[PDB]
Design a protein around this ligand. Structure first.
Ligand SMILES: Cc1cc2nc3c(=O)[nH]c(=O)nc-3n(C[C@H](O)[C@H](O)[C@H](O)COP(=O)(O)OP(=O)(O)OC[C@H]3O[C@@H](n4cnc5c(N)ncnc54)[C@H](O)[C@@H]3O)c2cc1C
Ligand SMILES: Cc1cc2nc3c(=O)[nH]c(=O)nc-3n(C[C@H](O)[C@H](O)[C@H](O)COP(=O)(O)OP(=O)(O)OC[C@H]3O[C@@H](n4cnc5c(N)ncnc54)[C@H](O)[C@@H]3O)c2cc1C
Ligand SMILES: COc1cc2c(C)cc(=O)[nH]c2c(OC)c1OC
Ligand SMILES: COc1cc2c(C)cc(=O)[nH]c2c(OC)c1OC
Ligand SMILES: [Zn+2]
Ligand SMILES: [Zn+2]
Lengths: 230, 230
């Protein structure tokens, strides 16, 4: 039915497993009659650096640059760079934001980290006060769809990498919940490179099949308990 | 002495509290007679995107681009882009790598994420085998000197942000420990912007004092227990 989805996609190679997961999301959401938009960050040469080029107006303090102060004021005055406002319009319209990426250093690739740093500015995504459950993107859903090099077993509490949920914390809690998003359970596609060709097709099908009923899902409780236990 | 230090610094404004912290680290380590080098990433316009420009010459598989495979092959065949190779020479020579940055979204700014993603490549920082305790940079020390916008009290386990140690995990453990580093206790300068002209000088002065005895320090046990445990 009547939903708008933004997929923020961070992989260099269209033929990759990430590209397959993004393409199946588009195909299935499209099939459902949803509105779908993809921000293909590498193809867009998306600027990840937080710099003074992100404000085009008179600086609030031209003597000592403070990226958070200057972008907050620029957002209110409409003087942010247009690549930022282009992504902001997509997020604003979206009911669900899916992030599709390979795990780099237990986190997002820098090009996507740059999307979070620059697009989710004060005034647009949160305010002080106006964060966590009162964040400005309240009402919207977010979902991380992550691929890893490590196996599910490496990503357990007693495994070497620790539990998968541990690395989710700065993303689900520190970023998405902070901006007010309700967070759907992560899609984690373990070790596609080590899996067989059929185990891969299976992981792509499993994502497609989940997407069929994504509008029926409740979010996670995005708490310290959920991520860490005890 | 005879020790080498690399400071990887990620802040746009030389007059910032981050800039002050970097400058006192240069001043004090220089005073002790250490060899000191600073990678000032915003001044270098450091590239954060992981792309096929990171390999010069021609590719291992030009049909399907795999960043990890290609940069592993390029490292071995000495055909990585010169910005990467320049940083790897700094790291190879360094006995201690200090990361100086403001926390962005419970993590490093994207410009710094990009240095970790691009410089810490397979064959250089890690391989199979050679990770965690046996990572390729074993013997070297690493230290995160982070400033935050939130207060220490927000960064307690039952506070709004959770324990600081929770966000340190993907950086200290998933990145630095993985590559072989012994991780020195992070230096966390909580909410400098809400603090006095002093308190701030207190904070800078304490970073300078800690640096006096930095070579006597023992690394933290970089384990799940240290980050999450009882
Ligand atoms: C800087 C860097 C940091 C990293 N850090 C981490 C980390 O911290 N933790 C960790 O676990 N991993 C890490 N990795 C590894 C990375 O997460 C994995 O390599 C990545 O997740 C694999 O996803 P991919 O799309 O690149 O896989 P691909 O190699 O593209 O996928 C595997 C295979 O599936 C094929 N395929 C594509 N579509 C389909 C389909 N329709 N059906 C069947 N097969 C298909 C592909 O062509 C390929 O042959 C890191 C990698 C780099 C480069
Ligand atoms: C995208 C983004 C994401 C963020 N995400 C997070 C997050 O997840 N969690 C979080 O807690 N915060 C977050 N922050 C806020 C950020 O971490 C802090 O704003 C930053 O850490 C403050 O350090 P600074 O150097 O930038 O401060 P400054 O503003 O430069 O420091 C405060 C004052 O100290 C002055 N000063 C400089 N040198 C000295 C000195 N020698 N002695 C005394 N004073 C001096 C400065 O001029 C200034 O007036 C985020 C910010 C942005 C922009
Ligand atoms: C930094 O690169 C990689 C890092 C990791 C880390 C930190 C943990 C892990 O379990 N697997 C990895 C991996 O896959 C085997 C990588 O390369 C593909
Ligand atoms: C994205 O920006 C900010 C984010 C945070 C987060 C996630 C937690 C926190 O405790 N403080 C923050 C902060 O300091 C006021 C920021 O700067 C405005
Ligand atoms: Zn949460
Ligand atoms: Zn560790």
């Amino acid at each position: 039915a009547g939903k708008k989805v933004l997929i923020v996609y961070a992989h260099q190679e269209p033929k990759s497993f990430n590209g397959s997961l993004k393409n199946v999301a588009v195909d299935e959401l499209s099939r459902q009659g949803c509105t779908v938009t993809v921000s293909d960050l590498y193809a867009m040469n998306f600027e990840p650096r937080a710099t003074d080029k992100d404000i085009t107006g008179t600086l609030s303090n031209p003597e000592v640059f403070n990226y958070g102060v200057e972008t907050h004021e620029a957002y209110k005055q409409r003087s942010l760079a247009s690549d930022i406002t282009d992504e902001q319009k997509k997020v604003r319209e979206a009911d669900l934001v899916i992030f599709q990426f390979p795990l780099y250093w237990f986190s997002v690739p820098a090009i996507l980290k740059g999307w979070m740093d620059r697009v989710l500015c004060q005034g647009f995504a949160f305010d002080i006060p106006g964060f966590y459950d009162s964040g400005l993107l309240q009402g919207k859903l977010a979902l991380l769809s992550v691929t890893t090099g490590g196996t599910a077993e490496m990503y357990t509490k007693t495994g070497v990498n620790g539990d998968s949920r541990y690395f989710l914390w700065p993303l689900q809690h520190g970023t998405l919940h902070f901006c007010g998003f309700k967070v759907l359970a992560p899609q984690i596609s373990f070790a596609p490179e080590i899996a067989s060709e059929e185990e891969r097709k299976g992981m792509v099908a499993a994502w497609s099949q989940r997407l069929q009923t994504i509008w029926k899902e409740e979010p996670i409780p995005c708490t310290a308990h959920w991520h860490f236990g005890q």
